[PDB]
Design a protein around this nucleic acid. Structure first.
Ligand SMILES: [K+]
Ligand SMILES: [K+]
Ligand SMILES: [K+]
Ligand SMILES: [K+]
Ligand SMILES: [K+]
Ligand SMILES: [K+]
Ligand SMILES: [K+]
Ligand SMILES: [K+]
Ligand SMILES: [K+]
Ligand SMILES: [K+]
Ligand SMILES: [K+]
Ligand SMILES: [Mg+2]
Ligand SMILES: [Mg+2]
Ligand SMILES: [Mg+2]
Ligand SMILES: [Mg+2]
Ligand SMILES: [Mg+2]
Ligand SMILES: [Mg+2]
Ligand SMILES: [Mg+2]
Ligand SMILES: [Mg+2]
Ligand SMILES: [Mg+2]
Ligand SMILES: [Mg+2]
Ligand SMILES: [Mg+2]
Ligand SMILES: [Mg+2]
Ligand SMILES: [Zn+2]
Lengths: 82, 153, 205, 96, 127, 114, 60
RNA sequence: UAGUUGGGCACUCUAGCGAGACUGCCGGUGACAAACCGGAGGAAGGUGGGGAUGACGUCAAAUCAUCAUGCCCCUUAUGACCUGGGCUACACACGUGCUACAAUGGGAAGUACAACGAGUCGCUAGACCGCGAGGUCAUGCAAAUCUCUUAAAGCUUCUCUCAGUUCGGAUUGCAGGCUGCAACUCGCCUGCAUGAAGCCGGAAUCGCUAGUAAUCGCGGAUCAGCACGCCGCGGUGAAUACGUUC
């Protein structure tokens, strides 16, 4: 996977936005196109609207979700069945 | 082919038994050009034959070939709207080929764990005039005799 | 069935490369520089009867041999035209360019020149049969051991395209030692492209 | 001194190699060679058609013929003579 | 004094040298039995002596490289026949009738484009 | 026997250990190396003391219902958080990126010709 | 969109991996030989014309 | 210690020039021809093997998406820029392959033999670290000089004993190595763990006549990274051809 020396990855703009909202009593939805961003404890407790190709699907972060990419929690394509 | 009979490539004699027939046996048992494994299996089987029977394995193998090699085969002929078999004497080249083919195939089908053991058992049975290979020769002769009414073709 | 390009078939057997230079790290750069040079020269000297451009490279220099059946027109008065061409080529390439003009004796035996002539006539709405016939006449009189020509497209603006060709003498395309020149040209007409292919079999090698 | 010659056509390569040997020997320097080196060959396979038709291919090859020349006890004149002797543009020459 | 020879088979090339002796064969500084662990191949190498009736008369030193063991065995056999020619021209007739002088030219046929091997073609489905 | 699973008797000790869940061939070699017991002996030929030493190593290891609970917890964690992988597990489709247009029979199950 | 794509390819890439090769003669993106910076089609065409030094039809 | 060093190119090899193979010579048949059969010699004999080479044409076959192009169409949009997504979907059907179902085998140790090609910020020695993928230091080479690269089948031992297994290697969990700005959609690889179907395959159907089939590896183009595909290379290496009814 992602090599250890490299650290995590998180788009700087997304990381900056979450850090700005850190000092907040109540969190506001963060609209992002950054599928690549990795989830952080700072991300915990927020609602992030991740772009899924055509619209920003909201996702509530939690300590269970940490350690994964945001895009994985926003399915791209819909398949109801046949 | 259409042009006519083609040259038959030759075979050198076996290194230790000095027989072309043993070389042909190695060729038949060989797979994927693994001639080393093939030759080792043949020699192990011959050793087993000499052990379990005091006779020379080469003589035993020749006896098995005599017992298994057919004489009359059946070739299918389509006559108008009816297709049926026709008896045909086997030229000696195809005789040895069929003998080796039957021996190797039925040996591979035997139940013994190792191929050389299977081959040795099959060879000894064929020499004693019994086993699957001898049964195949009997069935071939039986089919030829049954369709013997068509020998004029 | 399809046929190998007559020149490409003999390149390295009896035909030699037009790009007569060697390079390892600069191979791609030199090749693209040659392509741009050839394209620019064709555009610039289109009216001049230019056939072959042989490019050689010696350090920063570039030696360009241009074959033409109108050497005087290409050279200009007192070499004015060739000198202006050298300046333009120096600008385009970024390095010194020596230009050498060559006289195409017997222009009728050049595949590209014959094809260009036929294409010009077709653009002028000459009968394709007559154009090819006179081309073959001139080539044979020049002394070609054989010639072959083909024009394909919407002949006379016909709705259904077809190909009509002519030949005289011998054009043994399968003979490798045979010295056969080949060229393909396009005539743009009111109804689109017409392809003019010419084979000229000269004395074999 | 060591001279490596490379070319796409062995005929012109041999011509240039003979010229180098002739000028050196005339100058009096000792020459060993020419020594043929294993010609490099590269192969390029391209689909003959411009669309689909994968099975029909065509193969082109680029060959680099190479010659080696060794000059021993080179006289002072030989260096300038070899540098003045000009090969065709189709031959690549390397010194030492 | 030594009698030289060159043998070739597939990509294998063998420089053979006969010297009068007991029939010992060494290949690339190792004994024949070590180098060729196949009895059939060793017999193949010794074929020239059998036809020329020179069993044990000459020992062989072979510097061989290229190809595999079977190809190198054929090259050793070819070089031995050539070295025997040098030893005595009269062996030429016997060696020729044995075919040992003939250079086996069966080489690996080149792969063809559009075919998975020299002649094997891709599995074909009509529809 | 060792971890509650009756490993084969006549088989060699390394292979009989592999029959335990959560233990592969490499792990079996490592534990036998720690215990000092030769890998060739059959488990029937193993002495009581060697068996007890093997038991201590395995207990130190994590296997059987413990490992099964752990892996099920991980898979359940994915499914509950609603990851893409969780939905893959829920719908019985390849989770590691394979293409589902063909193949995928291992996850999907037997083919339904409909 | 050939001209726009060619211009975009000519411009410096935003990231290293984004850089990709086109046939500088026709702009074809697929099957571009680094040695010649040409697509297979243009390479075959120019090789036939004999304007690629050294290259010639292979056969053995 | 090593073809190392000296020394020599003799051999091999490399690559220019040549020789050779032409029914040329001999016997027989043949319409005194063409030619055919056999023999000698020779490395090669009747086109020696293979490649390139693809007639006039055929299927309004394929390609307006390589390129070019008449005509028609759009022109603040069918043109242009950006991020993200899709081309990777998945109840199903088909084609082409890879791996298997095992003992002519799996596994452990030791030992032997290639060829074609690629290499500059690229091929990387050697050493050290790491179980491994790889990482660090660092060496030679723009190369018949160094490297990728001690090839795998093979051969010799030891073990496994016919078991859905020590066959099988899917799927899955975990923990990691790389490339890249970035590996979730969606890369490859490694270790641990798990261990799926599969016991040789219905009707039917495919390739191949010899260094071929089969089988074993190796290199290459594309390429930051990524092939069971393609192109090429060599290793080992068979069975069969009675005959032209179908
Ligand atoms: K997929
Ligand atoms: K499929
Ligand atoms: K490209
Ligand atoms: K020579
Ligand atoms: K177009
Ligand atoms: K158009
Ligand atoms: K289909
Ligand atoms: K495949
Ligand atoms: K074994
Ligand atoms: K990915
Ligand atoms: K690669
Ligand atoms: Mg294909
Ligand atoms: Mg092969
Ligand atoms: Mg286990
Ligand atoms: Mg994938
Ligand atoms: Mg790219
Ligand atoms: Mg021909
Ligand atoms: Mg169509
Ligand atoms: Mg258009
Ligand atoms: Mg985009
Ligand atoms: Mg696709
Ligand atoms: Mg079984
Ligand atoms: Mg054939
Ligand atoms: Zn192009």
């Amino acid at each position: 996977g992602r090599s250890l020396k490299k650290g995590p990855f998180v788009d700087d703009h997304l990381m900056k936005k979450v850090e700005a909202q850190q000092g907040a009593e109540k969190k506001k939805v963060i609209k992002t196109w950054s599928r690549r961003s990795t989830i952080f404890p700072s991300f915990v407790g927020f609602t992030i609207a991740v772009y899924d190709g055509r619209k920003h699907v909201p996702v509530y972060i939690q300590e269970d979700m940490v350690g994964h990419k945001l895009g994985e929690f926003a399915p791209t394509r819909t398949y109801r069945g046949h | 082919p259409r042009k006519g009979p083609v040259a038959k490539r030759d075979v050198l004699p076996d290194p230790i038994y000095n027989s072309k027939l043993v070389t042909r046996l190695i060729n038949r048992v060989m797979v994927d050009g693994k001639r080393g494994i093939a030759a080792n299996i043949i020699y192990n089987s011959f050793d087993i034959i000499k052990e379990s029977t005091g006779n020379d394995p080469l003589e035993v193998f020749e006896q098995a070939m005599k017992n298994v090699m057919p004489v009359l085969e059946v070739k299918a002929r389509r006559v108008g709207g009816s297709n049926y078999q026709v008896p045909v004497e086997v030229r000696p080249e195809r005789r040895t080929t069929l003998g080796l083919r039957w021996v190797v195939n039925y040996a591979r089908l035997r139940g013994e764990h190792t191929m050389e053991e299977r081959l040795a058992k099959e060879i000894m049975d064929a020499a004693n005039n019994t086993g699957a290979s001898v049964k195949k020769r009997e069935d071939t002769h039986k089919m030829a005799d049954a369709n013997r009414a068509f020998a004029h073709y | 069935g399809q046929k190998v390009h007559p020149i490409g078939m003999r390149v390295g057997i009896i035909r030699d490369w037009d790009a007569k230079w060697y390079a390892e790290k600069e191979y791609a750069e030199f090749l693209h520089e040659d392509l741009r040079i050839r394209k620019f020269i064709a555009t610039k000297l289109a009216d001049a009867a230019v056939s072959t451009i042989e490019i050689e490279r010696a350090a920063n220099r570039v030696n360009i041999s241009i074959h033409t059946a109108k050497p005087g027109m290409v050279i200009g008065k007192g070499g004015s035209e060739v000198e202006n061409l050298r300046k333009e080529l120096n600008k385009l390439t970024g390095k010194r360019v020596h230009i050498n003009i060559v006289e195409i004796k017997k222009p009728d035996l050049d595949a590209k020149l014959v094809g260009e002539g036929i294409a010009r006539q077709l653009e002028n709405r000459v009968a394709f049969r007559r154009a090819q016939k006179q081309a073959i006449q001139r080539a044979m009189r020049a002394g070609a051991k054989g010639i072959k020509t083909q024009v394909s497209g919407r002949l006379n603006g016909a709705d259904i395209a077809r190909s009509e060709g002519y030949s005289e003498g011998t054009v043994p395309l399968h003979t490798l030692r045979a010295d056969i020149d080949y060229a393909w040209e396009e005539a743009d007409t009111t109804y689109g492209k017409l392809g003019v292919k010419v084979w000229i079999y000269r004395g074999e090698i | 001194i060591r001279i490596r010659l490379k070319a796409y056509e062995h005929r012109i390569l041999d011509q240039s190699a003979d010229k180098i040997v002739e000028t050196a020997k005339r100058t009096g320097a000792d020459v060993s060679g020419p020594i043929p080196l294993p010609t490099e060959r590269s192969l390029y396979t391209v689909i003959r058609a411009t669309h689909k038709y994968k099975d029909s291919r065509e193969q082109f090859e680029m060959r680099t013929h190479k010659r080696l020349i060794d000059i021993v006890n080179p006289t002072p004149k030989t260096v300038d003579a070899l540098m003045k002797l000009d090969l065709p543009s189709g031959v690549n020459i390397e010194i030492k | 004094v030594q009698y030289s020879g060159t043998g070739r088979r597939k990509n294998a090339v063998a420089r053979v040298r006969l010297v009068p002796g007991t029939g010992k064969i060494t290949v690339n500084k190792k004994d024949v039995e070590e180098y060729i662990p196949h009895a059939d191949l060793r017999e193949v190498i010794n074929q020239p002596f059998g036809v020329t009736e020179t069993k044990g008369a000459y020992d062989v030193i072979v510097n061989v490289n290229g190809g595999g063991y079977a190809g190198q065995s054929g090259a050793i056999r070819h070089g031995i026949a050539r070295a025997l020619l040098q030893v005595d021209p009269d062996f030429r007739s016997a060696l020729k009738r044995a075919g040992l002088l003939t250079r086996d030219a069966r080489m690996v046929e080149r792969k063809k484009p559009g075919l998975k091997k020299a002649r094997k073609a891709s599995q074909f489905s009509k529809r | 026997r060792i971890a509650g699973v009756d490993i084969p008797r006549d088989k060699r000790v390394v292979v009989s250990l592999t029959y335990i869940y959560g233990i592969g061939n490499t792990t079996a070699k490592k534990v036998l190396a720690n215990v000092g017991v030769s890998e060739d002996v059959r488990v029937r030929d193993l002495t009581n003391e060697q068996t007890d030493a093997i038991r201590a190593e395995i207990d130190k290891l994590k296997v059987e219902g413990d490992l099964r609970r752990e892996v099920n917890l991980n898979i359940k964690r994915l499914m509950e958080i609603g990851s893409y992988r969780g939905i893959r597990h829920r719908r019985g489709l390849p989770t590691r990126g394979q293409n589902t247009k063909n193949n995928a029979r291992t996850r999907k199950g037997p083919t339904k010709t409909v | 969109a050939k001209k726009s794509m060619i211009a975009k390819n000519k411009r410096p890439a935003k990231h290293s991996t984004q850089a990709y090769t086109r046939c500088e003669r026709c702009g074809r993106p697929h099957s571009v030989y680094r040695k010649f910076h040409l697509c297979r089609i243009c390479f075959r065409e120019l090789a036939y014309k004999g304007q690629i030094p050294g290259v010639k039809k292979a056969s053995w």
